[PDB]
Copies of this chain bind each other. A is one copy, B any other.
Amino acid sequence: MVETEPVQGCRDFPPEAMRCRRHLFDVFHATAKTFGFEEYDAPVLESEELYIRKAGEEITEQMFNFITKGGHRVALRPEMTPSLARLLLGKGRSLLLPAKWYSIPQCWRYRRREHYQWNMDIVGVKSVSAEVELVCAACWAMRSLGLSSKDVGIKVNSRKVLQTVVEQAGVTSDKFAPVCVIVDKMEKIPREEVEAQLAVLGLEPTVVDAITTTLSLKSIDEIAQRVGEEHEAVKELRQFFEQVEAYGYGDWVLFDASVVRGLAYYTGIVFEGFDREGKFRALCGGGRYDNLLTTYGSPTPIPCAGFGFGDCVIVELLQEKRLLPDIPHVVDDVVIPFDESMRPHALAVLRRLRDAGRSADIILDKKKVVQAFNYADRVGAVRAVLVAPEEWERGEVQVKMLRRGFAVPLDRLV
C-alpha cells in the first residue's frame, strides 16, 4: 500500500475539514469585500533573493528553500509581503494609489510546515487611517466568526518610540531592525538572553536599560512623559485610537508598549491580535512598513501598512469557544429514478432543477428507492424528487421534504 499520510508537516483537507477552512475563508473574502480590498495572487515559488534581509528573522531563518536543476536559488514563500512588494515595484507609476490588496496565500517553512495566511495591505497611504482600517478589518473578521471583544483584542504600539530611544543613545539606524527582532523575543526567551543578544549587536548596558524601561511603559501618557506629547508615535497612536473609537470598535483595541513584532521592515505602528485568556499565540500580526519598497529599489518611497492572519490559531480559538460546529454538506434536491427505465426522464428533471439555480444530484448507481432516500438524507438533501412512471404520465413527480410525500407538476418544481 502507498503511504496514506500526507508529506511531513502538511495537512489534508477532505470535505469535512475543507468545509471548516472554507467557512473561515468565506469570512476573509467577505471582510475584504466589505472593506473594498482587491484580490491578488503570486506564485508560491519565489526567488530566494527576495527574502535575504539579514536581520536574523525567524521567518527568514526557517525558509523552505532549494536549488533548481539549472542552479537558481528559489524558495516556497514564507510570507506574502515581499511578493506584494515585487508586484507593486513592477507596476511602477502605472499603479493607482491608494491601493488596497488582499490574498489568502499558503506559506511555507522547513510541527507544521505550511499554513494559509490572509494578507491585507494598504499602499500609498501615509496616515494612520490605514492602520485603523487594517485593525478594524481584522476585528471585523473575528466578530464575523462569532468572537466578541471579551474573547479577543488587538494590542497596538509604535516602533518609533523605541527608534528614538535607540537613536538618542548613538546607535546606528541600520541596527534598529535587528533590535526589534531581538526585543520581539522577550515573551519567549529569558531577559538575560535578550540583553545578551543586544550586547552582541553592539549596545552598551545603559542603552539596554532604556530599551527595557520603554517596553514596560503602560500607557500613551507615560510615553508622552518620556518622549514628549509632540513625538510622532504619541500623535499617531492618539489619532489611531480616536479613529477606532469612532468606527465603534474601541473595546477591541488597546495600547501595549511591548509589541514590536519580529519582522525587520516595520517602521511605525505595529499590532497583533490575541485571545484574552492567554492560551494561544498571536491570531494576527501587522504594521506599517514605509521603507521596504525603497530597499527593493523603488526610486520613490512608498508608504505601506498591512497584516497577516493565519489559519491555524483562529481555528483553535473557535474550537475552544465552541464556534466551529460541524457544517454538514447540503444540496437542494436529490432526484431518484424509480428504476433504470426512468433514468432518461429523471435526467430531464435534473436538468430543469439545475437550470433554475438549484443544487441537485441524481442517484447515479442502481438503487432501490428506500436506499436512494437514505442516501439523500446522508448528503443533507432538502428535498427528494422521485421520478416514477405513474406520476410521469400525469406530467408529475413525487416530492418529499427531508428538513409523507406529494405529487407535483414538472413546471411547479422550481
Contacts and interface: CB of A to CB of B under 8 A. Distances in A.
Contacts of A15: 38-40, 101
Contacts of A366: 127
Contacts of A133: 362, 364
Q: Chain A contact residues: over half helix, strand or loop, or mixed?
A: mixed
Contact of A34 (B13, B18, B126, B359): B359
Nearest to A122: B364
A228 interface: no
A297 interface: yes
Give how many copies assemble into the complex: 2
Interface string A365-398: 1100000000100110000000000000000000
A7 B91 contact: no
A42 B5 CA distance: 11
Contact of A365 (B47, B90, B125, B358): B125
26 contacts: A2-B85, A2-B297, A4-B89, A6-B42, A10-B43, A12-B43, A12-B87, A13-B40, A13-B41, A13-B42, A14-B87, A15-B101, A18-B38, A18-B40, A34-B357, A35-B354, A96-B378, A98-B375, A100-B361, A124-B365, A127-B366, A129-B365, A242-B344, A246-B343, A246-B344, A247-B351
Given A6-B86, A125-B365, 16 more contacts: A2-B86, A2-B89, A3-B49, A6-B43, A7-B74, A12-B87, A12-B90, A13-B42, A35-B359, A98-B365, A125-B364, A129-B343, A140-B354, A247-B347, A247-B348, A247-B350
